Design a protein around this ligand. Structure first.
Ligand SMILES: Nc1ncnc2c1ncn2[C@@H]1O[C@H](COP(=O)(O)OP(=O)(O)O)[C@@H](O)[C@H]1O
Ligand SMILES: Nc1ncnc2c1ncn2[C@@H]1O[C@H](COP(=O)(O)OP(=O)(O)O)[C@@H](O)[C@H]1O
Lengths: 241, 241
């Protein structure tokens, strides 16, 4: 069983810094996951990381690309210092949605990833923000992680988010919103920023169409994600299957 | 006036370590060039950098991709530590030859690069070894650096190398080999590893055909390159124009 874990920007960053508390917790979780599964990490937050090195505004798209260029290698260095605690290494992979249309590009990427996994190295994927901007504009890697799950032959995508699950209505607006534990179909009526719930549901529709699964849970408190993946009991979050 | 400096793996590597000395020398040189020019760096040695962290056999191709994934971000952090001496930052760009065929990918890349240069950030380009292997197999970024030069609107590509220039015959094999100081045409008759002189000549042919220039010079002794670029005077190397 191979899983893809996707962590959004908010999960690993505050507005002016990286969240070392949350990164530490995530990395300890990934180290444990790696004993039980083959694990691929899809990370965001290169822009946050770059912003710690260069204080320019994030609204302009081209500014975001520059910040990502500066931030990406530093973000990887942070993951590597934290992984060192568990005697693990992380390898950087940059991909775009268009790479996934290419048999050749996908095959080369899968070769590297498969071998990393074989050596117990953690593959860490992010968008190539030099050549593509889709995930910077809208989605924050939700789609990229879904494509990775299918094309690298993983069984499950786990999205760790500031959203703890999918509800019958917006849970931040409506205190009576009820959590949907299981979704087997994504309604078209359900479908610029991080992407919100819509990019999460679009990723799920892609995965459902390729007979794969998605689990949506909190990256702020890892209890639900931990119990699902390590205790095989669902006590929160939404499973799409 | 904009230039690409390409540094090969030999020039910044030793047998089982990075050449920190020659990197330091390179960065000091780049810091002075930035006073006079818009500068783009194309670097190799992600594989050497990775072998420093992971002891697997460098001769296998998929191993090289893995070593590059680990090494690339570490290599960038070493550039950054050296650039901090001049209060400079580097930003990572990963490209492939195939990216250069797409107008959209190249455009997104140039947008980021142009802005980095405006802001004073050094763009540091390498091949994306997840999705392409061409330069790993044969050429060591000669061709990628030629494409970068043309498509990001630089006037001159400087290749820094083992060899101090292009010669009328192989200077390793012949004591009377004469160095050709200026070259106006690439004879088709002149046309796996780092590539030898031929990938350098293919690069020059590409650039002459696009009304651009190339300077082949030593990366071990920077005097010829420094004098050529900072003192507009050729005392060595080969100029292609
Ligand atoms: N039906 C719904 N179920 C869950 N969350 C929803 C729903 N409708 C709206 N939201 C809201 O979407 C918001 C944006 O999510 P977002 O911040 O993009 O997640 P991430 O940062 O992990 O991408 C959340 O604050 C959430 O409250
Ligand atoms: N006509 C020539 N001019 C210069 N070098 C040549 C020529 N023919 C063969 N060579 C060989 O090719 C080498 C340059 O290629 P390479 O070792 O790949 O350089 P780099 O260190 O830049 O990767 C030279 O050191 C030389 O031994």
């Amino acid at each position: 069983k191979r899983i893809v874990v996707k962590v959004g920007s908010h999960v690993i960053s505050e507005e002016n810094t990286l969240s070392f508390e949350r990164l530490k917790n995530l990395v300890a979780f990934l180290a444990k996951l790696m004993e039980k599964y083959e694990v691929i990490l899809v990370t965001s937050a290169a822009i946050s990381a770059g912003h710690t090195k260069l204080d320019i505004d994030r609204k302009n798209l081209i500014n975001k690309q520059v910040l990502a260029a500066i931030g990406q290698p530093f973000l990887i260095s942070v993951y590597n210092e934290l992984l060192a605690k568990f005697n693990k290494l992380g390898g950087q992979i940059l991909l775009t949605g268009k790479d996934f249309d290419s048999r050749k590009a996908t095959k080369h990427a899968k070769n590297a990833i498969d071998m990393m996994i074989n050596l117990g190295i953690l593959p860490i994927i992010n968008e190539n923000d030099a050549t593509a901007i889709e995930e910077i504009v809208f989605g924050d890697n939700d789609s990229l992680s879904a494509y990775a799950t299918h094309f690298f032959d993983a069984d499950l995508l786990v999205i760790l988010s500031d959203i703890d699950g999918f509800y019958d209505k917006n849970p931040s607006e409506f205190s009576d919103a009820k959590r949907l534990e299981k979704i087997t179909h994504i309604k078209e009526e359900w479908l610029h920023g991080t992407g919100g719930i819509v990019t999460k549901l679009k990723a799920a529709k892609f995965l459902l169409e390729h007979n794969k699964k998605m689990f949506l849970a909190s990256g702020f408190d890892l209890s639900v994600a931990k119990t699902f993946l390590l205790e095989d009991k669902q006590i929160g979050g939404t499973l799409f299957e």
